[PDB]
Scaffold this active site. Structure first.
Site, PDB file in Angstrom:
ATOM      1  N   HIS A   1       1.344  16.578 -27.943  1.00 35.25           N
ATOM      2  CA  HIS A   1       1.533  17.555 -29.025  1.00 35.25           C
ATOM      3  C   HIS A   1       0.184  18.096 -29.457  1.00 35.25           C
ATOM      4  O   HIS A   1      -0.769  17.344 -29.720  1.00 35.25           O
ATOM      5  CB  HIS A   1       2.196  16.918 -30.276  1.00 35.25           C
ATOM      6  CG  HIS A   1       3.639  16.640 -30.109  1.00 35.25           C
ATOM      7  ND1 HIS A   1       4.548  16.659 -31.139  1.00 35.25           N
ATOM      8  CD2 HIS A   1       4.351  16.351 -28.982  1.00 35.25           C
ATOM      9  CE1 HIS A   1       5.751  16.380 -30.601  1.00 35.25           C
ATOM     10  NE2 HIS A   1       5.648  16.210 -29.319  1.00 35.25           N
TER      11      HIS A   1
ATOM     12  N   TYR B   1       6.867  18.375 -41.092  1.00 35.18           N
ATOM     13  CA  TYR B   1       6.762  17.652 -42.404  1.00 35.18           C
ATOM     14  C   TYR B   1       7.227  18.650 -43.480  1.00 35.18           C
ATOM     15  O   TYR B   1       6.755  19.778 -43.609  1.00 35.18           O
ATOM     16  CB  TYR B   1       5.331  17.166 -42.600  1.00 35.18           C
ATOM     17  CG  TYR B   1       4.830  16.027 -41.792  1.00 35.18           C
ATOM     18  CD1 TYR B   1       4.288  16.254 -40.506  1.00 35.18           C
ATOM     19  CD2 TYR B   1       4.795  14.727 -42.266  1.00 35.18           C
ATOM     20  CE1 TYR B   1       3.751  15.204 -39.786  1.00 35.18           C
ATOM     21  CE2 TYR B   1       4.280  13.645 -41.540  1.00 35.18           C
ATOM     22  CZ  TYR B   1       3.730  13.905 -40.294  1.00 35.18           C
ATOM     23  OH  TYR B   1       3.215  12.913 -39.508  1.00 35.18           O
TER      24      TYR B   1
ATOM     25  N   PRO C   1       3.613   5.511 -44.057  1.00 32.95           N
ATOM     26  CA  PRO C   1       3.858   6.194 -42.777  1.00 32.95           C
ATOM     27  C   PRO C   1       3.452   7.648 -42.665  1.00 32.95           C
ATOM     28  O   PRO C   1       3.259   8.128 -41.537  1.00 32.95           O
ATOM     29  CB  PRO C   1       5.365   6.079 -42.552  1.00 32.95           C
ATOM     30  CG  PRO C   1       5.857   5.126 -43.539  1.00 32.95           C
ATOM     31  CD  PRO C   1       4.810   4.895 -44.629  1.00 32.95           C
TER      32      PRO C   1
ATOM     33  N   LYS D   1      -0.623   6.465 -39.161  1.00 37.28           N
ATOM     34  CA  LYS D   1      -1.836   5.672 -38.973  1.00 37.28           C
ATOM     35  C   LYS D   1      -1.720   4.163 -38.783  1.00 37.28           C
ATOM     36  O   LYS D   1      -2.760   3.631 -38.344  1.00 37.28           O
ATOM     37  CB  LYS D   1      -2.713   5.855 -40.250  1.00 37.28           C
ATOM     38  CG  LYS D   1      -3.675   6.968 -40.328  1.00 37.28           C
ATOM     39  CD  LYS D   1      -3.468   8.118 -39.467  1.00 37.28           C
ATOM     40  CE  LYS D   1      -4.573   8.806 -38.835  1.00 37.28           C
ATOM     41  NZ  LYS D   1      -4.141   9.673 -37.732  1.00 37.28           N
TER      42      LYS D   1
ATOM     43  N   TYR E   1      -5.787  13.858 -38.724  1.00 39.21           N
ATOM     44  CA  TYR E   1      -4.512  13.645 -38.034  1.00 39.21           C
ATOM     45  C   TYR E   1      -4.695  13.132 -36.638  1.00 39.21           C
ATOM     46  O   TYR E   1      -4.010  12.119 -36.284  1.00 39.21           O
ATOM     47  CB  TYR E   1      -3.604  14.911 -38.187  1.00 39.21           C
ATOM     48  CG  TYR E   1      -2.160  14.593 -37.948  1.00 39.21           C
ATOM     49  CD1 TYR E   1      -1.651  14.628 -36.607  1.00 39.21           C
ATOM     50  CD2 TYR E   1      -1.331  14.137 -39.001  1.00 39.21           C
ATOM     51  CE1 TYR E   1      -0.315  14.262 -36.403  1.00 39.21           C
ATOM     52  CE2 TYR E   1       0.004  13.761 -38.787  1.00 39.21           C
ATOM     53  CZ  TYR E   1       0.496  13.863 -37.460  1.00 39.21           C
ATOM     54  OH  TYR E   1       1.765  13.559 -37.190  1.00 39.21           O
TER      55      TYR E   1
END
Ligand SMILES: Cc1cc2nc3c(=O)[nH]c(=O)nc-3n(C[C@H](O)[C@H](O)[C@H](O)COP(=O)(O)OP(=O)(O)OC[C@H]3O[C@@H](n4cnc5c(N)ncnc54)[C@H](O)[C@@H]3O)c2cc1C
Ligand SMILES: Cc1cc2nc3c(=O)[nH]c(=O)nc-3n(C[C@H](O)[C@H](O)[C@H](O)COP(=O)(O)OP(=O)(O)OC[C@H]3O[C@@H](n4cnc5c(N)ncnc54)[C@H](O)[C@@H]3O)c2cc1C
Lengths: 391, 391
Positions: free
Chosen positions: A72, A201, A293, A297, A385
């Site tokens: 991704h 998200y 979550p 990580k 990220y």
């Protein structure tokens, strides 16, 4: 029995450490409280950072991941009105993330270990740690109703949140930092095609929603819920309606639904212990720290602890440089704290918090608008990220 | 009397709007509650963004500023242990900030106005606003014990926090967003050479400290204090010892001290009103919004409101496009909210908040370490500090 390094917990942390050490010639024994299918039943993680991707390759367990994991290059955030994409690859200077299930990673490591014939004791009950500060620490456990003693040089506590490792250090030796969020995530595993080729998200007034995946025909969805909800109260239908209610209309309309393979509620928490070692005991993964979550990580941090522990033990064994092991906690905590801050930040901007005044609501919106709007802000998200460099 | 645009308040906002309008051929009258020296006695602002620098030039009041203001290409943050410089100029793509006192800006605008012979009524007492929604609003005020009426087309409410403007709008028409911080800043104006050629923001365990300047022989220092402190309790000596205690040792040792020219405590607050207009009344500056001093934004936001109001009124007068005035609040609030979020952020990372758990403390440290450490994080600070583009 006698070994070099005894490992408590047959989760990803213990398994990966075990794998790396075996391949390097350092004998290790893994002690797990549960059975192999109990372990394999945990859904957990979907997103791996490139460093963990590289560590798996290094443990020589990446065939399947290379074949089956999805690369991704972006993620989306939807907040009141819009859908914004963060181009990770371009914003992080060429880095990506990999979607490969925790269960899958665990299965691959268990197989590799089994093949190699390295020792693993499942259903090891009543593990106890002894003489941590001596020259010769040992572990006691019960196999049936027989208490065995394992002698070793070092103990790696890879037993997650509730393990015995952390508990075995004089309470007075540790400083604890904890944040408990007033909400959990209700997750749904379904054998349906994901709604998007990338993660979504969503910050919605009714609460957070997350659209994730396991594969092209396997999806993982989550909705924020109060800590008082019981999953027995969330039929598949109820879950589907609610999710759909928190997403962009064009996203909800394309959503393919279906019966759940698994449903579970996970409470969100922030937790760090300082230091992460005691004598001959070293904590790694969830045993030492928990992140919400939101920033993907936890497993990724276990991997950085494990990478650090492994390299330090190699040096101690092959180079006779046992002194560097004193530097374990300093190394890991630099990385932990930066991952914990990203995780907290992600959590505070995407979730709906109870008793939030008008100001705090508006700032929540503005942070999104600012960070999703500026090339500098986007970059901050992207580099965090993908994962910050390993030290 | 009759005018085009009536302005309530002879602060920087009203003065600058007044100046820009006069020069553009739109008559305006300014009504101020106080005297000219009372106004001129306020110390306030030291830092101007380039947009406000450009607006002053455009009002043709920049001679003195061009001569006397100091151009700064960086700022420093000192947090537990270190001193970090943010290169603004390079991180913002070539932008800087200018140090020129609010008092100085005010004096320059008052002079320019006086020269031009535009109307200003000092000691205008009991200002009242009438018929806001009609075609012909008017203002009543008392000059002595005589109540005069000023007829106008539009009213600009540039009367700061406590002005009458905001109060004159039906309470039901406004949405208020406010945050009150549990601390104020004790400021000290001294005729001593500044400690650094650039500003120093300091996060110290005893609380925030700021080293600022007015000129090469004029300094402005601030220390965070509880809201219960009275300035009568802070002798110069007490101030000096305390400041010195919150700074890097090498900085405290180079510090030249001296008697105060002014000492005052300012409480910190966040405040925004939506919308910022009503009928023929338009709010600008502190009348519409308050930011904590931390990000050096208040006066800078007044300037962006004023720039927007002025351009909209020009269009209405010279182009007969009165309809664009409906877009005033939408325009300003995009900018306000982004400046308020930067200001809140700056405030939360540099100040010492009461009842803060260990976690929240550590995250405070990490934000600093992260943002002062990453090229992306540094850039976020830099583009916000210099000021985001005007719309
Ligand atoms: C909903 C959810 C989503 C997640 N998403 C992600 C994601 O996308 N990406 C990411 O990086 N992270 C994510 N994480 C975090 C990640 O799942 C964990 O960080 C990871 O499981 C930590 O691995 P570990 O090996 O340290 O511990 P665990 O997986 O907890 O395993 C520890 C092992 O030790 C054993 N054990 C416990 N006590 C004892 C004892 N006394 N004796 C012997 N054995 C014992 C346990 O049985 C277990 O097998 C997620 C977590 C959750 C809850
Ligand atoms: C400690 C401190 C430091 C600061 N630092 C900075 C900085 O470095 N950079 C920055 O950008 N900003 C900073 N600010 C903010 C800045 O000083 C203000 O935002 C600025 O004063 C706003 O100008 P204004 O014209 O809107 O209002 P004001 O300066 O409040 O003036 C309003 C005028 O209206 C008058 N008035 C009030 N009521 C009435 C009434 N009924 N009738 C008639 N007249 C009336 C008042 O007497 C006053 O003259 C700082 C503020 C403080 C407190």
């Amino acid at each position: 029995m006698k070994t070099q390094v005894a490992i408590i917990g047959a989760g990803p942390s213990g398994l990966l450490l075990g794998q790396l050490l075996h391949k390097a010639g350092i004998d290790n024994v893994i002690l797990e409280r549960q059975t192999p299918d109990y372990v394999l039943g945990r859904i957990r993680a979907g997103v791996l950072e490139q460093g963990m991707v590289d560590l798996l390759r290094e443990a020589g367990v990446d065939r399947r991941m290379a074949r089956d994991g999805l690369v991704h290059e972006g993620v989306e955030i939807a907040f009141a009105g819009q859908r914004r994409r963060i181009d990770l690859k371009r914003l992080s200077g060429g880095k990506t993330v990999t979607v490969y299930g925790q269960t899958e990673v665990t299965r691959d490591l268990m197989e590799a270990r089994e093949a190699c014939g390295a020792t693993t004791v499942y259903q090891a009950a009543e593990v106890r740690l002894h003489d941590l500060q001596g020259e010769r620490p040992y572990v006691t456990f019960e196999r049936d109703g027989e208490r065995l003693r394992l002698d070793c040089d070092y103990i790696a506590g890879c037993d997650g949140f509730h393990g015995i490792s952390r508990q075995s250090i004089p309470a007075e030796r540790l400083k604890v930092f904890e944040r408990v969020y007033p909400f959990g995530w209700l997750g749904l595993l379904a054998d349906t095609p994901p709604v998007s080729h990338e993660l979504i998200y969503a910050n919605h007034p009714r609460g957070f929603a997350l659209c994730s995946q396991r594969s092209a025909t396997r999806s993982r969805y989550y909705v924020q819920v109060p800590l008082t909800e019981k999953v027995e109260d969330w039929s598949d239908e109820r879950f589907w309606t609610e999710l759909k209610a928190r997403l962009p209309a064009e996203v909800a309309e394309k959503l393919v639904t279906g019966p759940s393979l698994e449903k579970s509620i996970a409470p969100l928490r922030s937790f760090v212990v300082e230091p992460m070692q005691h004598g001959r005991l070293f904590l790694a993964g969830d045993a030492a720290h928990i992140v919400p979550p939101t920033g993907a990580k936890g497993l990724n941090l276990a991997a950085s602890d494990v990478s650090t522990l492994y390299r330090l033990l190699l040096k101690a064994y092959r180079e006779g440089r046992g002194e560097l092991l004193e530097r374990y906690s300093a190394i890991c905590l630099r990385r932990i704290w930066k991952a914990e801050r990203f995780s907290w930040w992600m959590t505070s901007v995407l979730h709906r918090f109870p008793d939030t005044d008008a100001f705090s609501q508006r700032i929540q919106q503005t942070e999104l608008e600012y960070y999703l709007g500026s090339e500098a802000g986007l970059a901050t998200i992207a580099e965090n990220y993908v994962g910050l460099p390993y030290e």
